[PDB]
Paper text:
ASICs, and by extension, members of the ENaC/DEG superfamily of ion channels, are trimers, with each subunit composed of large extracellular domains, two transmembrane (TM) helices, and intracellular amino and carboxy termini. Upon activation by rapid exposure to low pH, homotrimeric ASIC1a channels open, exhibiting modest Na+ selectivity with PNa/PK ~ 7.8 and PNa/PCa ~ 18.5 and subsequently entering a long-lived desensitized state in hundreds of milliseconds. Chicken ASIC1, an ortholog of mammalian ASIC1a, is, from a structural standpoint, the most well-characterized member of the ENaC/DEG family of ion channels, with X-ray and single-particle cryo-EM structures of the detergent-solubilized channel determined in the resting, open and desensitized states. Here, we present structures of cASIC1 solubilized without the use of detergent, using SMA copolymers, in distinct conformational states at low and high pH.
In contrast, cASIC1-SMA particles maintained at pH 8.0 occupy a high pH resting conformation, characterized by an expanded acidic pocket that resembles the high pH, resting state structures solved by X-ray crystallography and single particle cryo-EM. We propose that the limited resolution of the resting channel structure, while presumably impacted by cryo-EM grid conditions, including thicker ice than for the pH 7.0 grids, may also be due to structural flexibility inherent to the resting channel conformation in the absence of divalent cations, which serve to stabilize an expanded acidic pocket at high pH but which are incompatible with current SMA-based purification strategies. While the quality of the resting channel density map that includes the pre-TM1 residues was not sufficient for unambiguous model building, no significant differences in reentrant loop conformation were observed between the desensitized or resting channels at the current resolutions, allowing us to rigid body fit the pre-TM1 structural element derived from the desensitized state structure into the resting state map. In accord with previously solved structures, the homotrimeric ASIC1 channel resembles a clenched fist, harboring domain-swapped TM2 helices. Both the desensitized and resting channels adopt closed ion channel gates, as evidenced by a constriction between residues 433–436 within the upper third of the TMD. In structures of both desensitized and resting cASIC1-SMA channels, the ‘upper’ ion permeation pathway is comprised of TM2a residues and contains a closed gate between Gly 432 and Gly 436, in agreement with existing X-ray and cryo-EM models. The ‘lower’ ion conduction pathway of resting and desensitized cASIC1-SMA channels is formed by reentrant amino terminal residues Ser 24 through His 29, the latter of which is situated below the GAS belt and is oriented towards the threefold axis where it forms a constriction below the gate in the desensitized channel.
Residue numbers in the entry:
A (entry chain B), B (entry chain C), C (entry chain A): 17 to 462
């Protein structure tokens, strides 16, 4: 009814003394100042937590979960040479000879300074082109044959002390050519596990990089490979190999323990964080990752721009000849990487498992095992120090760190800190706001 | 008294207009819907924060505390050979000859291919067993004598620029045998400190791995050691050495700065996190850690299963002969590691100090110091490149990172977000719930 | 007016039934116990969150921001020799000969054991001092000339596949002498960027450490340098080089991919955390960092204590002669580092960008490129393996991790959890406390 009658019976805390049934005194203004200030101190502090929730913040919980049976990560490796030298042929030097950086522009040799007599004359019968009847070419078939064969390289593999197999090593194709993948987990093979830490309860391979089978550099080229040794990218079984980008290396003559530490990272979907919220099954890979998007970003580009695919690409498109490489494929990489890089962006999913690495090198061989390794694989003693390496990937302990992001302020924490200060300053509620609306609805009709 | 009389004078916000002293109108149901909804919106949002507190969550605070006098971590190392070759004896080849992988099953030699004439005939008088009167054996005494002696290996140790001592190096026993521990901190010696970073204000040892004193491999065995170089585990002084598991290595001929970074990790006790809440003094180590539990997990097993202890074990039990090794001890490791691994689990304590490591190799020696290092220790020039290494462990700066876990939601934050939304939705309290009980207690008696 | 009249009309929840207009019964004490307990349960729980806010806590948010154009960090390097041997002179051996550890106390040679005939006689005409007319000396001018020249060392630099320049390498001065800085960003040059990851889209230098130009060690000195190879500190362009402290190394004959990962760390100002809150422009560096404070901590010390500055110091003070080095400068370092270390402390600012590093070594050269690298730079084959190295610094992917510290409890979260439990326990507000003061103000006047 009356304003002095309504304010004497409502649930607000200040109006019972402002609008009292008494004359105007000094107490009415000290209740007016202390209510109009405590309504303004509620106003700029409640709008803090509203705008703080509107940022959608999140802080991270780290934890070290202990386990017993961890999975082994897919040890993916290949030699830093593209392909062997004794497995190239005269027909191989015709369709793809200029691209392999041993030929000039007119399908002839560059300057033959610092070329051995036995090294040049094995190449010299390959570059006759006299009554040359060519054969049909395929760049995938060239990387199948001329690449480094697994049954020649790997002297002794191991896993958890048990023996290994070159049939367990699964071929892939990257920018370095014929690359293999231990513990791939595809083709129905279950991913192997580990039950202990230490240097013996992981992979232990003993490779042979075949330094005599490297491409002899005679002319200064753009992409000559001076180094010897392999390159390794450690990843989960879902992510395709990206050895060209995410790969470290080990040296020959250096047994290299690479201690991993399994991490299980969990991000948040928008609007909290940035992850691929759904699964997002890509067109040429059954699962999604940060790399499987990136090769699918490049595969659909080179099909729509050059009507073929490279040898390191998934799908079923036919492989580009070196006629398509020197004219279409290579000018279309830098046209996307440099110019149109903002047209394609991959959102990393928020269930990702990574593997750190802590390097440590030990020199192989000792002199006590020097003469033993020479005869046991029919090699010279000078051959052993610069061809034979050992890699060793394991886990420190059976535990994995998790890096998960907790939402720092949900809507249930906002309601606890709106009325946590709404009740502190004026004592109202959602019903008191509806109560003040229910009195003002009666005043406007009278 | 009456329901219209009680609701007109209570502290709830909605019942003053639902149960008014007026006829049934459209305002009674719009106060009934807006109260039965604001009682249900309180119901499913307060049960969010109750169940969120019942998970006992925690998020982590990272901080980089700066300091002046950091402690130096216990640099623990041993050569990757088990024991020397010139310090084995005919009696040593009888009681423990087959276990050291130089003998066949009938206490005879394996195939002697790739064996030098001077290397075989020093072994050939050890394996006579003709009128052989044996001596009493002890596997701890064999690892005391035949192991790599510290006064022969370490050419020059240093610490903070000041000189060092082989008497400061303290012997332990691991799976590799005679291992030493710089800055052990036990036997009343105070743990040394550092007052600066950089490569000169830490340890700088110059070892000599004695590659001529390695075990010559002639037959293909299960545990032949091809590599040369040492293995190092960095740890705090409390934790016992676990070089077999938590150890990295450095190579010979390679001065290897190993930059540490001191971390002081703090976890939470249950039910927040998982730590050993109390101290938990183990039976054979004065302090508790993740490793001291694990060796105590293995020591009590092999005493209860084989009535002895291994050479890398604490306590006072007598050491197992190789008769007990080939028949009891080795079959009881894999019976616990593979089968009964779930019977024993070590809870890592929540006051743990760790040390990261960032490797970096520099080749030693230069040609300017090549001929100097040859004569100054009476060594050949070919000996220097493959025997002499330098390790260098220090800190980057005088600061330690801390990784501590804050309890993200205590009971004082739950009470602020129960009544933070209880006062927002219905305006009640704990006393209003007691007030509604105090009116309903009067109704049931009338 | 009356206490039974005031409590029947106030906004507290308990006083309406304690001070009722009825005789003393059992309900008055059960409302007295349940109010004096719910006033005490508010008391010790509200003082929890008050003292929890008074600690000013903070928890950290980790995030992995993806980007396209990252900046390249300033690759700062220098050879581990101080200066060349063929660029020292007779006058250079007079003013500074004893300090370079080739002379005795009486300006004569130490013991010449293990000294070559061609190596001693090139030094022997430098140490005549017979009718010696000296030249004016400057230690900055000695480190300009006698140091390792960039145009002799760097065989081939690269960046993003494009060519490089020795004019892009900018000289600085550290404890190792003549040090250079790729991508320095000073002198108006804009800091270069990267648009891709992988081993080819970063720096790729091919140095030549000039192992024939090292100082030949003949006598056992305090600071002889046995090792060969360079030292590298990766940092942002703002921070001055601190290669002596924050530097890792790479070896010769070892192509060493050093995979970075850009981090953008953000701390908090006091009283939350510890950072330099303002900019804090130092006296001799235009920007502030943790290192630029430390050299400014040492520059103002040695000017106020020795009236000069060292060669690795900023400013405009004249450089100290070796007369000032052996008598003033060296005794004033350890007088500050060991004794007065607590007089100077640098507060690290809270906008700091760091760069991690993940090492990986690959052996260079292969035998296929062995004879090519010998003639192409007019070097012997034995020279190539122990002088030629390659360093390679890049990024894994175009993304940077951020480690920022969120204030875990602001004043708006305190007010939500004071009245969140003030409204829960007694239902009061800030006005009810003023209401109880407004009744007690009337009682004391009557
Ligand atoms: C991510 O993993 C969590 C368990 O760690 C699971 O509950 C969730 O469903 C997963 N999400 C996706 C999209 O795979
Ligand atoms: C070992 O290699 C040599 C060539 O160096 C060859 O003549 C010999 O037949 C090989 N022996 C075996 C058993 O492979
Ligand atoms: C752990 O360390 C903290 C200080 O960092 C100390 O207050 C606490 O008592 C310690 N707890 C145990 C169980 O040692
Ligand atoms: C140095 O070693 C040789 C053996 O190579 C030995 O004959 C000689 O006596 C040794 N000299 C010293 C001083 O130890
Ligand atoms: C620090 O960086 C943030 C952006 O990352 C910026 O908003 C802030 O002003 C910076 N503060 C200082 C002192 O440079
Ligand atoms: C190459 O070096 C030799 C000395 O080893 C020198 O005699 C010759 O003139 C040099 N040639 C060139 C082209 O620099």
């Amino acid at each position: 009814v009356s304003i002095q009658a309504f304010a004497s019976s409502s649930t607000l805390h200040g109006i019972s003394h402002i609008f009292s049934y008494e004359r105007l005194s000094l107490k009415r203004v000290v209740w007016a100042l202390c209510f109009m200030g405590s309504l303004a101190l509620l106003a700029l502090v409640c709008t803090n937590r509203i705008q703080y929730y509107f940022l959608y913040p999140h802080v991270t919980k780290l934890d070290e979960v202990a386990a017993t049976r961890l999975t082994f990560p897919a040890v993916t490796f290949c030699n830093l040479n593209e392909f062997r030298f004794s497995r190239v042929t005269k027909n191989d030097l015709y369709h793809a000879g200029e691209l392999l950086a041993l030929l000039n522009n007119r399908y002839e040799i560059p300057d033959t300074q610092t070329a051995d007599e036995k090294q040049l004359e094995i190449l010299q019968d390959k570059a006759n082109f006299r009554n040359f009847k060519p054969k049909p070419f395929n760049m995938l078939e060239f990387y199948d044959r001329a690449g480094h064969d697994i049954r020649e390289m790997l002297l002794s593999c191991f896993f958890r002390g048990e023996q290994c197999s070159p049939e367990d090593f699964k071929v892939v194709f990257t920018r370095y050519g014929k690359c293999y993948t231990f513990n791939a987990g595809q083709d129905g093979k279950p991913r192997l596990i580990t039950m202990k830490g230490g240097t013996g309860n992981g992979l232990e391979i003993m490779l042979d990089i075949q330094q005599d089978e490297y491409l002899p550099v005679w002319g200064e080229t753009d992409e000559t490979s001076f180094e010897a040794g392999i390159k390794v990218q450690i990843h989960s079984q879902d992510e395709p190999p990206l050895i060209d980008q995410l790969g470290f290396g080990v040296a020959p003559g250096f047994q290299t323990f690479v201690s991993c530490q399994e991490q299980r990272l969990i991000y948040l979907p928008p609007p909290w964080g940035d992850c691929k919220a759904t699964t997002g099954d890509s067109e040429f890979y059954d699962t999604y990752s940060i790399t499987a998007c990136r090769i699918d970003c490049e595969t659909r580009y080179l099909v729509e721009n050059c009507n073929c695919r490279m040898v390191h690409m998934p799908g079923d498109a036919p492989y580009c000849t070196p006629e398509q490489y020197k004219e279409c494929a290579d000018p279309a990489l830098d046209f996307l990487v440099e110019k149109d890089n903002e047209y394609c962006v991959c959102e990393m999913p928020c269930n990702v498992t990574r593997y750190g690495k802590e390097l440590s090198m030990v020199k192989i061989p000792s002199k006590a095992s020097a003469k033993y390794l020479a005869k046991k694989y029919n090699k010279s003693e000078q051959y052993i120090g610069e061809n034979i390496l050992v890699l060793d990937i394991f886990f420190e302990a059976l535990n994995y760190e998790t890096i998960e992001q907790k939402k720092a302020y949900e809507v249930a924490g906002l309601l606890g800190d709106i009325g946590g200060q709404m009740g502190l300053f004026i004592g109202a509620s959602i019903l008191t706001v509806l109560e003040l609306f229910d009195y003002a609805y009666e005043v406007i009709k009278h």
